[model samples]
Target: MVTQLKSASEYDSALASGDKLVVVDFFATWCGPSKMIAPMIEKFAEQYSDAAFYKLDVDEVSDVAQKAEVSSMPTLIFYKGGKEVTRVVGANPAAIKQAIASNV
Candidate 1:
């Protein structure tokens, strides 16, 4: 199962995760775009073991979403050394896969 950031504390630690490519899926319960991306993200998590995959529900953790500035329904944010490298804002698997690969 993919890691779930349920609180701001968990989100903070995930951000502090240095050296590894941190892949975050900021989604909401009512989001339709997230459907197509979720499975692919989980697949990427299996394939790219070095890249950490995390899922956060904006509705569940409003604090994390606000701090992350996730205006998109499904924000695929990538980080390395606790800094944002890039992000994918839509249900584009090709770009998502590429982001995960290149971020590492």
Candidate 2:
């Protein structure tokens, strides 16, 4: 299941949850690219159950975005063992999958 991290604290908790892999989609409400990538991210959530999947709305959770250093909409960050391993900017499904495959 995909968890919606509504606050920085919640995002912190998820990061420390010790899941093998954590995927976070940083998005904004007005971002068309974010909208376009939502469904694809949802699909990845189902496909990659072993990893924790999360969504953080930059508008709603600005603190988390600041901590994450997210400057662009739809920035997909991959975390392994509570640390960020890599991130993809924009709505690129193939690159996202490639990151998942290499990490997971």
Candidate 3:
């Protein structure tokens, strides 16, 4: 299932451990596109048991966004072993899944 990341500490801890592939969705509650993409991400959370899924609100944790180098809403960053592997900008499920497929 998709989890909510609320702080840099949580982000750090989640990345430090758990599934090798961690998918973090950087989004804003006010963004419609983010809302649209959230469900697909949730769907993938169950589908991809090999990976861990997380969502961080840019509005709530701007530092996490800044640290992750996220400049836009609805961006899905794929991380492996606490480092960035790839990322998907916008609500494109095809690209998101491809990235996940490639990494996981």
User: lDDT, candidate 2, residue 21?
Assistant: 92
Q: What is the lDDT of residue 28 in candidate 1?
A: 81
Candidate 2 on 34-54: residue-level lDDT in tens? 999998999988998888889
TM-scores of all predicted structures = 0.94, 0.95, 0.96
For candidate 1, the 10 contiguous residues with the lowest summed lDDT are: 28-37
Q: Show where candidate 2 strays beyond 4 Å.
A: none
User: Taking the tens digit of each residue's C-alpha lDDT, what string does model 3 give over 1-47?
Assistant: 79999999999998997448998999999999999998899899999
Among the numbered candidates, top TM-score falls to 3
Instruction: Assess each prediction's global lDDT (C-alpha) against the native.
Output: 0.87, 0.89, 0.91
What is candidate 1's lDDT per residue for 41-103, written digit by digit as tens?
Answer: 889899999888999999999887888788887898998888889999989898998988887
Between candidates 1 and 3, the lDDT winner: 3
Model 1 Cα RMSD, 1 decimal: 1.0
Clash count (model 1, backbone only): 0
Model 2 C-alpha lDDT versus the unseen true structure? 0.89
Provide the lDDT at 40 for model 2. 90
What TM-score quantifies how close candidate 3 is to the native fold? 0.96
- Name the better of 2 and 3 by TM-score: 3
Q: Rank the candidates by TM-score, best first.
A: 3, 2, 1
Clashing pairs in 1: none
